[PDB]
Design a protein around this nucleic acid. Structure first.
Ligand SMILES: [Zn+2]
Lengths: 217, 101, 127, 69, 203, 68, 117
RNA sequence: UAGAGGAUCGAAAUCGAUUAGAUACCGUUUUAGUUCUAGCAGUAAACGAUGCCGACUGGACGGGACAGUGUGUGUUGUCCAUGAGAAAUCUUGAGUAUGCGGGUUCUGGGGAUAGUAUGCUCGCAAGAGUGAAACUUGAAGAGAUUGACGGAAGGACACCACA
């Protein structure tokens, strides 16, 4: 029933883009939440983190409104967060899930020591900030768990991590700032140059120029 | 409110004071509102009757210049200066001494 | 060691702006021993210094590979058993980075000091 | 903060600590001076009178108390 | 230096570039410039811009256009009225997609606007005039080519062809010159085969 | 996990970099024609947005495509 | 108070774009057409769609009124404006080059007839 | 505090108005003081409410001094980015990563009691400097958002407004 609307959406319908790691590599904006259901099919879980009420005064009545914060990720390397405020609570949760899907990102995973095994923890230390809220992640040895707060825990499990330490600072009872400071702490560990990214690779064309002929006809 | 803090004074401690022309209160000279005007000595609705009265064959009516000086309360009340919006507060107007006539 | 800390802040500034070279208007003897330990580990391309009978001059050639460098003041005294606690405080992971000490055998990083049974005064780090 | 400056740091940090109220009662030894029962956790008393006290608003009530010795 | 422009020869185009005042810049110049520049005279305090500069960059701009197989996805943009005629002529001679008039905010990002677009390369006749089109390219991964004059900003621009923007003649001169390279470098065409059709480009 | 590396700053490019762009040029046959090949360049959003991403691009083209 | 609403203006532009070559410049003709094309009920509405059209027609057809793009009319107005004038800018030969423009010529060695001022 | 001086203005005092009442705003009569010399005192929204010294860092339009000749050094005003910040805002810093260490000081640790008692040092005094507790109490505070109100300012209007 999904009649796609953009170029990247059309290719995913024709099975020219088979994974999600083909879009992340060239930084192509995802505009439709159906491109994520069909490339990570039925391994996408959800978690409602928070819901509260907002109020405004005008010349025609006080408007009450509901805000929701939601996170999604499969269990492997992807995770995203979104948020919306609408009249009733069911349409706010459902609209904030379409925004979380369109903000999926990848996460780099690594080992605590050595170079052998399958990755279980974060690749180095990192921190994130959002309005005086500060989160620190530290890589943990195998068979440790995820030691952190409750709402932090649901973000680090949907990303595919198994071992981690955290320390937090600042005003963390603003639960939407606490959730954004900890998504930025994973984007920081994944943004450091490691000594195996030192040697270059050959260049290639993004998928909008490889499949140029298929677009017209 | 303002980056001036309300007055045109930089890199000096004190700056001299004056007495307002309407109420007579003491104010810094850099903070007062100052206006300059050149008025004809004779009113404009009286020039015709003055051209038949003159005894000289060529007459020029005189003009004088006047500088005025008021305080913030006296200029705001008299509508010499008005309340402006946040962005329009930053617009300064000058004189350009290099104008040709 | 006031010249060692001035040099590390000017390097962090250029490595963030994307510069290729850096010219500083000073140069000391142990500032050049610290730089020679980044060259043999692959983190800079090279350098060169001038003699002018003033405080000296030095020109560093950057690479694209440095994440950060620092200096520690004051220069604490660490026994060979306390080498490993300073490593968990200063480097992000267990596989890369180098902490440098001034021992009775020269300037060594934290892997060599353990294979020679010595301690000394801490100077800085880089990863 | 030089390497030979530890006497300047003990002198400085002891004086800042006195600005904590809980620490100041212990350090100056005046934590039990103005206290109606001193160091006991419970105490005995004989009952003189039997009074009633108003609640503090916004609560309407009368709480029953006693005057003792 | 002078090796990218020496692979072709400005065959007689020195006339068409000097006749229409395509080298007369402006009074002001930034430290961004002074590398495309030749000099400024004392008579009118006008800045003169090198002709190899305008020829070195037109060689690169033509090679980026040809890199796209289907040229029906290279939008050209011009808001002002002097460019209404030149731009529409430089789309049948090549095969691009023209966008003239005022630029509607939301053309590339909003999918509920009058007409929707999605080019792979963008060409602009003026940076300060087509301000919105440059700014909107930074939301959809789009390269841009410009015609920076002397005082414009170079932000969000990759290839800058230093030329003249004000005069109606110089605007049509630039689009004529670049038009023949794209035919020359694709098919077996001639560079100087006529100098009378530059009257069809002028406003 | 992989990230491209910028062609002008040697910085790896993130996936949420929506101002980063890719440029392909035609491999110019001698005698002024196109033969059928291209050369790719990658740029990141930071260099492109500060406005200096133009003085650095032609400098690099002089080393790989018109060097000597 | 003789302003025409949006539903009566917005409709006359749809008519002037599809059935444009069926309309000419008199009220009694354009009213006959809007009875053929449109389907409204109020006889006051056709009277105003027809009266706004006859003003659009002698604007579009004589001078300047953009904001509507008539496909069939973008040929007559274009084939008469592309008349090549009697002189091109490749005719003058006494090109009065300047001085600093001149010394930029010989250092690259350009060809032509450049007369300094 | 001592001497000299005395135009103008003016606490305190005093009448006349205004007012329900005004020991006030406004006015009349009239002083200490306001000035100079020699000293005491030691406080201010003494404010950019913004320690001192050292290293490094994009643009645009200016000013003031010196020296050169198409520029430089020391200072300084306005406006834009990058970066920073809770935000307002900051641009030789309020920038240089919680990626946290250049040298060396001072001050703060919920509100109120209270800069109050007491001791001590200084002063002719008026006072200044240093400086608590018992008892009480759940907030006091910063910046910004939408409303409501102003014995607030504008621009439009109307024979339930004027002409
Ligand atoms: Zn006054």
């Amino acid at each position: 029933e999904w009649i796609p609307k953009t170029a990247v959406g059309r290719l995913v319908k024709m099975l020219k883009i088979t994974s999600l790691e083909q879009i992340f590599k060239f930084s192509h904006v995802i505009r439709e939440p159906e491109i994520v259901d069909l490339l990570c099919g039925n391994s996408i879980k959800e978690e409602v983190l928070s819901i509260k009420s907002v109020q405004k005064q005008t010349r025609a009545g006080q408007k009450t409104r509901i805000k929701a914060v939601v996170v999604v990720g499969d269990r492997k390397g992807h995770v995203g967060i979104g948020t919306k405020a609408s009249k009733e609570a069911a349409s706010a949760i459902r609209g904030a899930i379409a925004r979380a899907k369109c903000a999926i990102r990848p996460v780099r995973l690594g080992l605590w020591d050595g170079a052998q095994g399958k990755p279980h923890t974060v690749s180095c230390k990192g921190s994130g900030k959002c309005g005086t809220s500060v989160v620190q992640v530290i890589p943990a040895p195998r068979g440790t768990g995820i030691i952190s707060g409750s709402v932090n825990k649901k973000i680090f499990e949907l990303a595919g991590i198994k071992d981690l330490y955290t320390l937090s600072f600042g005003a963390t009872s603003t639960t939407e700032n606490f959730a954004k400071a900890s998504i930025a702490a994973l984007e920081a560990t994944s943004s450091m140059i490691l000594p195996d990214q030192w040697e270059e690779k050959p260049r290639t064309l993004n998928p909008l120029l490889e499949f140029a002929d298929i677009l017209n006809q | 409110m303002r980056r001036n803090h309300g007055r045109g004074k930089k890199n000096r401690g004190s700056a001299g004071s004056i007495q307002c022309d309407k109420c007579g209160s003491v104010t810094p000279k850099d903070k007062a509102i100052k206006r300059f005007r050149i008025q004809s000595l004779i009113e404009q609705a009286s020039f015709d009757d003055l051209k038949q009265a003159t005894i000289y064959d060529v007459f020029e009516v005189p003009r004088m210049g006047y500088k005025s000086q008021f305080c913030v309360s006296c200029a705001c009340h008299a509508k010499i200066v008005r309340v402006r919006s946040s962005q329009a507060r930053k617009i300064r107007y000058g004189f350009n001494p290099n104008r040709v006539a | 060691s006031a010249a060692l800390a001035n040099m590390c802040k000017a390097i962090n500034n250029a490595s963030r702006a994307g510069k290729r070279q850096l010219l500083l208007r000073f140069s000391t003897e142990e500032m050049r021993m610290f730089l020679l330990q980044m060259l043999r580990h692959g983190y800079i391309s090279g350098f060169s210094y001038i003699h002018d009978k003033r405080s000296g001059k030095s020109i560093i050639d950057l690479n694209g590979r440095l994440n950060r460098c620092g200096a520690i003041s004051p220069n604490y005294i660490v026994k060979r058993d306390g080498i490993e606690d300073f490593r968990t405080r200063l480097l992000p992971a267990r596989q890369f980075g180098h902490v440098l000490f001034n021992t009775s055998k020269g300037i060594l990083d934290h892997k060599e000091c353990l294979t020679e049974n010595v301690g000394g005064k801490i100077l800085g780090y880089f990863y | 903060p030089g390497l030979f400056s530890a006497n300047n740091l003990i002198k400085s940090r002891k004086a800042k600590r006195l600005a904590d109220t809980a620490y100041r009662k212990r350090a100056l030894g005046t934590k039990y001076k103005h206290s109606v029962l001193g160091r006991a956790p419970q105490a005995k008393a004989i009952v003189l009178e039997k009074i009633g006290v108003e609640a503090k608003q916004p609560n309407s009530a009368i709480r029953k108390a006693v005057r003792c010795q | 230096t002078r090796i990218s422009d020496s692979i072709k020869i400005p065959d007689e185009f020195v006339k068409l570039l000097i006749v229409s005042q395509s080298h007369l810049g402006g009074t002001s110049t930034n430290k961004s410039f002074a590398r495309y520049l030749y000099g400024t005279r004392p008579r009118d305090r006008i800045n003169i811009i090198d002709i190899n500069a305008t020829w070195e960059k037109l060689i690169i701009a033509a090679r980026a256009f040809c890199g796209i197989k289907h040229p029906s996805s290279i939008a050209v943009v011009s808001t002002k009225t002097f460019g209404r005629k030149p731009v529409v002529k430089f789309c049948e001679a090549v095969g691009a997609t023209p966008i003239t008039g005022r630029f509607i905010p939301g053309s590339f990002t909003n999918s509920e606007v009058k007409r929707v677009y999605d080019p792979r390369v963008l060409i602009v006749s003026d940076t300060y005039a087509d301000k919105q089109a440059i700014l909107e390219s930074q939301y959809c991964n789009l390269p841009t080519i410009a015609f920076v004059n002397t005082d414009n900003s170079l932000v969000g621009v990759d290839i800058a062809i230093p030329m003249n923007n004000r005069s109606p003649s110089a605007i049509a001169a630039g689009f004529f010159i670049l038009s023949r390279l794209i035919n020359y470098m694709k098919t077996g065409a001639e560079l100087v085969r006529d100098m009378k059709e530059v009257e069809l480009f002028l406003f | 996990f992989e990230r491209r590396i910028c062609s002008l700053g040697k910085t790896p490019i993130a996936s949420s970099d929506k101002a980063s762009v890719q440029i392909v040029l035609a491999v110019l046959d001698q005698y002024g024609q196109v033969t059928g090949e291209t050369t790719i360049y990658d740029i990141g959003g930071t260099v492109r947005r500060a406005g200096m991403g133009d003085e650095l691009l032609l400098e690099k083209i002089r080393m790989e495509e018109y060097g000597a | 108070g003789c302003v025409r609403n949006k539903i009566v203006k917005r409709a006359a532009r749809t008519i002037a774009e599809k059935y444009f070559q069926r309309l000419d410049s008199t009220f009694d003709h354009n009213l006959l057409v809007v009875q053929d094309v449109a389907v409204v009920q109020s006889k006051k509405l056709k009277n105003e769609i027809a009266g706004y059209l006859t003003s659009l027609y002698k604007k579009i057809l004589k001078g300047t009124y953009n904001k509507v793009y008539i496909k069939s009319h973008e040929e007559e107005r274009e084939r008469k404006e592309n008349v090549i004038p009697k002189e091109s800018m490749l005719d003058v030969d006494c090109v009065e080059v300047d001085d600093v423009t001149m010394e930029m010529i010989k250092r690259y060695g350009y060809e032509g007839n450049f007369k300094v001022y």
